[PDB]
Every structure is written in structure tokens, then in C-alpha cells.
Amino acid sequence: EAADVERVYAAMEEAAGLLGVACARDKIYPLLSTFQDTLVSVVVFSMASGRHSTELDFSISVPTSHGDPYATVVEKGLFPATGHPVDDLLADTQKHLPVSMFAIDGEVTGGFKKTYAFFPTDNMPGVAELSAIPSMPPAVAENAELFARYGLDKVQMTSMDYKKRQVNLYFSELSAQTLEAESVLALVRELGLHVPNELGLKFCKRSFSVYPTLNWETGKIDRLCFAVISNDPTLVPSSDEGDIEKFHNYATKAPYAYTLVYGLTLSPKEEYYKLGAPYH
């Protein structure tokens, strides 16, 4: 449908406005039309805090029957192949594992950036199965022991950041021990990331997923995020009035067709939050 393809972009500008961000139709629409048979499907609008408060992602589901979604945009000329192992990763997962669904993501000013590999709820993998993937970063195996020591095993999904050449491993079936203040503190400190405070640790206690960020150059996890799912629009883990305001504003005025997933990302240098508002 032609109404849909405009409808999502009409709703897409509405959300990006609420943050005071300008969209770039030049880099957004070609990917949107390319997947319009799906837009008839999960479409998500996600924001970031801090020095990233000027950045917005949109995630779009693509069933596995449609084929490799990243292969579409390269051959169709929507994103050039980097010549780096991240090109081939998406196929290798579907090659090596039962992938039940895909997703694609972009940024409103830069265009396409990442894709997703979703796994079945009744067959989530561990880090051993993931590490077998030839195009997977070496760091995924090189971190296998650390993951286990903290209870990071079943992986709900992965994402591949193609501009940064980075993989996210969305860990699930987390033990209640894993999320406790003590362990959260030790995990972050061993990995050399920003230490959260009382609120951050109270936020992580609610987490349903924790996802580290790995790249191909070293074994260092670049950052690690805690995700919390809820309907409550006031759960952002910040006490700085602007974010408590900015995020609740977005949460309550985000356009929707027919829900929140918060993000607590801890980096080496600073601490920023994310909030994905879905359309479908």
C-alpha cells in the first residue's frame, strides 16, 4: 500500500519532531518502500539521551521468508558493503541457526545502520552455539567465560551494527541473582564501564534483558545495556529533570497504530538511556 508507506513516514516525522530532530527523506524512504509488502510487521521508534538526544532509530521487522534483509539493501544499492566480516554475519546466523524473524533499522539523518537476528522463544541459543559462527567476532568466544560467571547464557536475539562493525547479544532468561546490586557492580567494574547509582541498579533489578556490545578489533566489550519492558511511561533511570521530562514526553506522545522498552546503556565514559516506542 502507498498510504502505509507514507503513513509510517508521516508518523516517523511526528516522533522525530518531539525530540527536535529533522528527518532526511533522502536516506529514509528508499529503504521504507523496498520493504513495503511487510508494512501491511513490527515497526519501532527509539530515542537516546545525552549527547545522543539528537539521534533516533527506527526498527522494522522482516519475516525470514523474505530472505536476508541486509543482502537486499546492498544489492539494491541502499548501503555499500564494507568488505568486513559484519557483511556476512547475518547470513551465517541463519546458515548456522534457526532464525525465525529478521529486522532492519536506520537513523533518521544517516539512513540504514543495523539489522537484527531473532531467535525462537522455544529455542534460544547459548554463547557456545553463537561462537561457532565463522563470521562472529572472536570476542564472543573470548568472553564466553565472563558471560557464564554472571549467568549470561540464553540469547534472545542479536543485532549487527554495520557502521560501527558491532554485534549486540541480547541475553535473556536471566537469573534473579544476576541482576542484583552486587553482581551488577562487579560485572560493570570488571568490564571497565560507567558505574550506575542507586537508581540505575534499581532499574537493572527490573531488567528482562542485558545486552553487551562487541566488535571485531579487540576482546573488549564496548558497552553493555540493560533493557526494561513496561507500560509505565515514567521509568527512565535518570534523576536529571530534563531526561525525566524528555523521556516521559516521548513515551506519552509517541504515535501508535494499535508499550515501552527502556534502555540503560553503560559506556566507558558516560551514561545514557534509550526508549523504544513501537508503532505495531
Cell of 48: 537516546
Q: Which three cell numbers stand for residue 148?
A: 557464564
Q: What residues are paired with 61 via a beta bridge?
A: 103
Q: Write the single-letter amino acid at 178.
A: T
Inter-residue long-range contacts of 247-256, CB under 8 Å, 24+ positions, other chains counted: 247/47, 247/49, 247/273, 247/275, 249/18, 250/15, 250/18, 250/19, 250/47, 250/275, 250/277, 251/275, 251/277, 253/18, 254/15, 254/18, 254/45, 255/11, 255/14, 255/15, 255/45, 255/279
Question: 1: burial class by Cβ within 10 Å (0-12, 13-18, 19+)?
Answer: exposed
Hey, which bits of 146-270 come out as E strands?
155-161, 166-171, 209-215, 223-230, 260-266
Q: How far apart are the first and last CA of the chain?
A: 16
User: What one-character DSSP code corresponds to residue 245?
Assistant: H
Helices (H), the chain: 2-18, 25-34, 69-75, 86-96, 127-131, 138-142, 144-149, 181-190, 198-204, 241-253
H or E segment at 232?
none
Q: Which amino acid is at 11?
A: A
* Residue 39 CB neighbour total at 10 angstroms: 18
DSSP label at residue 154 = -
Measured between alpha carbons, how far is residue 5 from residues 2, 11, 16, 126, 220 in Å? 5, 10, 17, 37, 40
User: What SS3 class is residue 247?
Assistant: helix
> What does the block give as the cell for 71?
543482502
Torsion, Cα of 50, 198, 169, 270 (10° steps)? 30
**Closest C-alpha among 143, 146, 209, 130 to residue 174:** 209
Measured CA to CA, the distance from residue 156 to residue 97 in angstroms comes to 13
- Write the DSSP string, 39-108: ----EEEEEE-GGGTT-EEEEEEEEGGG--HHHHHHHTTSS---SSTHHHHHHHHHHHS---EEEEEEET
* 245: Cβ contacts below 8 Å, ≥ 6 apart: none
Bridge partners, 101 (sequence order):
63, 118
Radius of gyration of the chain (CA): 18
Residues β-bridged to residue 224: 212, 266
Amino acid sitting at position 219: G
Q: How far apart are CA 222 and CA 215, in angstroms?
A: 8
Query: What is the structure's resolution, reported in angstroms to one decimal?
Result: 3.5
Decide if 184 contacts 204 (C-beta within 8 A). yes
CB atoms within 10 A of CB 205: 14
Pairing of strands 260-266, 271-278: antiparallel
Q: How far apart are CA 50 and CA 162, in angstroms?
A: 22
What does the alpha-carbon distance between residue 43 and residue 219 come to, in Å, rounded to a whole number? 33
Annotation-wise, does 57 bind a ligand? yes
How far, in Å, CA of 105 to CA of 118, rounded?
Answer: 13
